[PDB]
Write a protein that binds this ligand. Structure first.
Ligand SMILES: Cc1cn([C@H]2C[C@H](O)[C@@H](COP(=O)(O)OP(=O)(O)CP(=O)(O)O)O2)c(=O)[nH]c1=O
Ligand SMILES: [Cr+3]
Length: 325
DNA sequence: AGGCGTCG
DNA sequence: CGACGCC
């Protein structure tokens, strides 16, 4: 990295403006600038040089100026010392606990994991499971464990019904050496635009994975989406593998491509691509890609027979899953 | 960007 | 329903 310290600084300032202050704009800004700066070809030597960059104005230039001057930033240093801040920020690491919740738990004297482990009566189910697996939900999933996971999901999926098409998208499809959470797309001939929404098509799969005791817990659970916890079998006389996070989405059969596009790419990549959609008078959704009208309102979706087709609609160059970050 | 599912 | 927290 060339300006690592300034990007690192601005991002730390970003989390703080979200998790602690909940000033979305002051978080988006430190975010926008951090990227505009990671791109910048030369080493930044001053605040004004950097202010010429779009996405960085006077309050960010000032902090850059102080960071170059002194090898640090006071505001960052104080923030790191403030107990209520490091507390609030840390509770966010628990899945289920976001900005507001972390704040109340801190406001009420709950700050640590153990404190939380002594006050489960305040957490909801999701926050509780998160608290239950705070250490395991941290560890990254190697590329091989994801394969073994995919093996169990894929196998059992057909065992129930052969007409099921499962695709472990997310970071895995992109070719990552490790993964945060196993994202699996699912589709079936009974689910279509013309259908009337089948809640059993996903439930059937979950109960089957639960029966085999792969999916242990259940965070979210609905018709299309399922957020939960899964786990690989403990081969006799070996330490059981960590409990991972697993999302399962049920995309209509005739809208599959919108599904894999969305579920694969990248959060940021989707942000950029979907933004470019409106740029071309289109609206990319994970079910359909319908063009924005001659004034705003989007009409009927444009048929798609490949991710490729989607990239073509927005006059954009196709990005093979691996270059979506 | 854009949406699903939960809590009260 | 709106806010949340998440993907
Ligand atoms: C986090 C996030 C994700 N996605 C999309 C792109 C993601 O690949 C997919 C689900 O995200 P997730 O499985 O949490 O991340 P991953 O990209 O699969 C990276 P990791 O392996 O850390 O989960 O939906 C979004 O559209 N918006 C978001 O805010
Ligand atoms: Cr993932």
């Amino acid at each position: 990295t060339l300006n690592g310290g300034i990007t690192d600084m601005l991002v730390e300032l970003a989390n703080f403006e979200k998790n602690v202050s909940q000033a979305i704009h002051k978080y988006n800004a430190y975010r926008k600038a951090a990227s505009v700066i990671a791109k910048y070809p030369h080493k930044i030597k001053s605040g004004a040089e950097a202010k010429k960059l779009p996405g960085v104005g006077t309050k960010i230039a000032e902090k850059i100026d102080e960071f170059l001057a002194t090898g640090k930033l006071r505001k960052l240093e104080k923030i790191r010392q403030d107990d209520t801040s490091s507390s609030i920020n840390f509770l966010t690491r628990v899945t289920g606990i976001g900005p507001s919740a972390a704040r109340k738990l801190v406001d009420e004297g709950i700050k640590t994991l153990e404190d939380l482990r002594k006050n489960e009566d305040k957490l909801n189910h999701h926050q509780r499971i998160g608290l239950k697996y705070f250490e395991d939900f941290e560890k990254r999933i190697p590329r091989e464990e994801m394969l073994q996971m995919q093996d169990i999901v894929l196998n059992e999926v057909k065992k129930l019904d052969p007409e099921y098409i499962a695709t472990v998208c997310g970071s895995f499809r992109r070719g990552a050496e490790s993964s945060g959470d196993m994202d699996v797309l699912l589709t079936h001939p009974n689910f279509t635009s013309e259908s009337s929404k089948q809640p059993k098509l996903l439930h059937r799969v979950v109960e089957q994975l639960q029966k085999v005791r792969f999916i242990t817990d259940t965070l979210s659970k609905g018709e299309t989406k399922f957020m939960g916890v899964c786990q690989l079998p403990s081969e006799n006389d070996e330490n059981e593998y960590p409990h991972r996070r697993i999302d399962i989405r049920l995309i209509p059969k005739d809208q599959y491509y919108c599904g894999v596009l969305y579920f694969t790419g990248s959060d940021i990549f989707n942000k950029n691509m979907r933004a470019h959609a409106l740029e071309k008078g289109f609206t990319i959704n994970e079910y359909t890609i319908r063009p924005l009208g001659v004034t705003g309102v989007a009409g009927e979706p444009l048929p798609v027979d490949s991710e490729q087709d989607i990239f073509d609609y927005i006059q954009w160059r196709y990005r093979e899953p691996k270059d979506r970050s």
